[PDB]
Amino acid sequence: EMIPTEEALRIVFGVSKRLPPVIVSLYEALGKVLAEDIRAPDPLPPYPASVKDGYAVVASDGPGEYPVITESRAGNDGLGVTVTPGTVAYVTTGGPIPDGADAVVQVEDTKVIGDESKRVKILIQTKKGTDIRRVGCDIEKDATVLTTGERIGASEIGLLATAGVTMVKVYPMPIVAILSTGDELVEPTAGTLGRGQIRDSNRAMLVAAVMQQQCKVVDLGIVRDDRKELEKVLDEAVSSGVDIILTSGGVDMGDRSFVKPLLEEKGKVYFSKVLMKPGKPLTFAEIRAKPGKTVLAFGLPGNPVSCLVCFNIFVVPTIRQLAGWTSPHPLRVRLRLQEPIKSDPIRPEFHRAIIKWKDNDGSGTPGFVAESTGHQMSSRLLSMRSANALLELPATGNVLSAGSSVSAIIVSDISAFSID
């Protein structure tokens, strides 16, 4: 009954489809994947431009004293002026090279002479083309500067701005609906708890996890253990326009667990048991919204750790696939254990760790190392605290010694890792 994680992931990958592209403004494009190629409408620079503050010269003149016939910093400066042999022009970095000049001698290789007509001493012999950016040096006209499937970061925004593109065709992020289930739950605003009550922590945790993925959230609240109630919430969520529904709890054993029977009634359940610790009751379904698009549903396990681990392993790549990422899979690295860890005898375990890069990983060479977050019980959300990786432990039941190597899934921005 329990399918391997690799199979469950292949099923999710084959079912999930990229969202239709949209047109957004320049700053709305940040973080999104391009759905069109971007072409430069003009060259960069669009005019021969100086690399230095100095003088535009005729290289063959060589060292000597010359009159300064114009000054060129921007725009129309020096328009219609020709730098002929025996003359020079002052230029600032980025200034347009006047017609006739063929090199720039930086100001450090010159000296101003006299005082009232402007004259300069060129102190070196330069070569044609020195310290000039030719037209199209950096970007040629009609070059493809960005391509469909490329994710937009800060330099890509810079390239869009360079090319004068301020309305961009991209793949959008999915809209995600989230609900919690359970008669024992109370809102996280609750003070004193009554007997048999706990605060709903999964919903806020998932809202935050989805916010970190840059998706709009639809918070559907706490749903009680009543089939008709959950049916109504799920039906309205499916017809609301969301792309993904996340539930937690009420998906495994127990006589008031209605998520799985409702997903089986409303859509197609691809799996409901995965060979993994934590996360074995994870349920994945596809529901058709009536005209009419597809909605993906993840029936996440109720235990807090299980809920977040399943989100990290299955929901994150699904969000990325819907958002057009060509490489949605998580970064996996190899690392060395800083302490001994016992694997499970039946299920491959995703053991929470805090990893860091060290100059010596224990073997004399630089590498990542990992520390366990401690007890791994699925009810213990403190085992996720500060965890930036999931160690992929095989189902051997053996104690993996300190210094041994394992594969690890990196789950939090690797560029925000705390240094050793």
Site for its own copies in 306-335 (CB under 8 A): 308, 311, 326-327, 329-334
Binds its own copies (CB under 8 A): choice among 4, 64, 67, 158: 158
Q: Are 57 and 50 in contact (CB under 8 A)?
A: no
Enumerate residues 79-138 that contact its own copies by CB under 8 A.
79, 92-96, 107, 133, 137-138
Enumerate residues 243-272 that contact Mg ion by CB under 5 A.
249-250
Cα 91 from chain centroid (whole Å): 41
Q: Does 45 bind Mg ion (CB under 5 A)?
A: no
The sign of the torsion formed by the CA atoms of 145, 148, 149, 151 equals positive
* Minimum distance from residue 222 beta carbon to Mg ion (Å): 11
Nearer to Mg ion, 172 or 249 (CB): 249
Burial status of residue 177 (CB atoms within 10 A of its CB: 0-12, 13-18, 19 or more): buried
Instruction: Give backbone dihedrals phi and psi of 204, rounded to 5 degrees, phi first.
Output: -60, -40
176-181 vs 217-223, strand pairing mode: parallel
- How many chain residues interact with its own copies (CB under 8 A)? 120
* Minimum distance from residue 176 beta carbon to its own copies (Å): 13
Q: Which amino acid is at 157?
A: I
Cβ-based neighbours of 419, under 8 Å, separated by 6 or more: 356, 357
Nearer to its own copies, 287 or 300 (CB): 300
88-91 vs 64-72, strand pairing mode: parallel
**Using CA atoms, how far apart are residues 34 and 210, in angstroms rounded to an integer?**
21
For residue 182, which of 226, 139, 150 has the smallest C-alpha distance?
226
Instruction: Take residue 94 and report the two structure tokens written for it.
Output: 């980025």
Nearer to its own copies, 172 or 267 (CB): 172
Nearer to its own copies, 208 or 402 (CB): 208
* Minimum distance from residue 64 beta carbon to its own copies (Å): 22
Enumerate residues 228-267 that contact its own copies by CB under 8 A.
252-257
Query: How far apart, in Å, are the Cα atoms of 353 and each of 248, 336, 365, 384, 415?
Result: 23, 11, 21, 8, 17
* Minimum distance from residue 115 beta carbon to its own copies (Å): 16
Which of the ranges 2-10, 169-177, 232-240, 358-366 carries the binding residues for its own copies, by CB under 8 A?
358-366
Angle made by CA atoms 240, 244, 246, in degrees to the nearest 5: 105
Nearer to its own copies, 13 or 27 (CB): 27
Contact partner, 36, from its own copies, Mg ion, none, Cβ < 5-8 Å per class: none
Binds its own copies (CB under 8 A): choice among 19, 146, 215, 246: 146
Q: Are 163 and 40 in contact (CB under 8 A)?
A: yes
Which of the ranges 39-47, 57-65, 112-120, 228-236 carries the binding residues for its own copies, by CB under 8 A?
39-47
Nearer to its own copies, 62 or 188 (CB): 188
Contact partner, 130, from Mg ion, its own copies, none, Cβ < 5-8 Å per class: none
Query: How far apart, in Å, are the Cα atoms of 72 and each of 14, 90, 94, 117?
Result: 59, 6, 9, 17
Enumerate residues 277-306 that contact its own copies by CB under 8 A.
302, 304
Binds Mg ion (CB under 5 A): choice among 78, 174, 182, 279: 182
Q: Specify which residues 410 forms β-bridges with.
A: 389
Binds its own copies (CB under 8 A): choice among 200, 243, 286, 349: 200
Which of the ranges 119-127, 152-160, 340-348, 395-403 carries the binding residues for its own copies, by CB under 8 A?
152-160
Nearer to Mg ion, 250 or 299 (CB): 250
Instruction: Take residue 76 and report the two structure tokens written for it.
Output: 């129309």
Enumerate residues 367-386 that contact its own copies by CB under 8 A.
367, 377, 379-382, 384-386
Enumerate residues 170-189 that contact its own copies by CB under 8 A.
182-184, 188-189
State the greatest distance between any 2 C-alpha atoms of the chain, in Å, as a whole number: 99
Which of the ranges 47-55, 170-178, 291-299, 392-400 carries the binding residues for its own copies, by CB under 8 A?
47-55
For residue 328, which of 349, 307, 311, 314 has the smallest C-alpha distance?
314
Which of the ranges 4-12, 242-250, 307-315, 377-385 carries the binding residues for Mg ion, by CB under 5 A?
242-250
Instruction: Take residue 303 and report the two structure tokens written for it.
Output: 């235990």
Instruction: Give backbone dihedrals phi and psi of 334, rounded to 5 degrees, phi first.
Output: -110, 145
Contact partner, 44, from its own copies, Mg ion, none, Cβ < 5-8 Å per class: its own copies
Contact partner, 86, from Mg ion, its own copies, none, Cβ < 5-8 Å per class: none
DSSP-derived secondary structure for 228-244: HHHHHHHHHHHTTT-SE
Cα 313 from chain centroid (whole Å): 16
Name the residues that contact Mg ion, by CB under 5 A. 182, 249-250
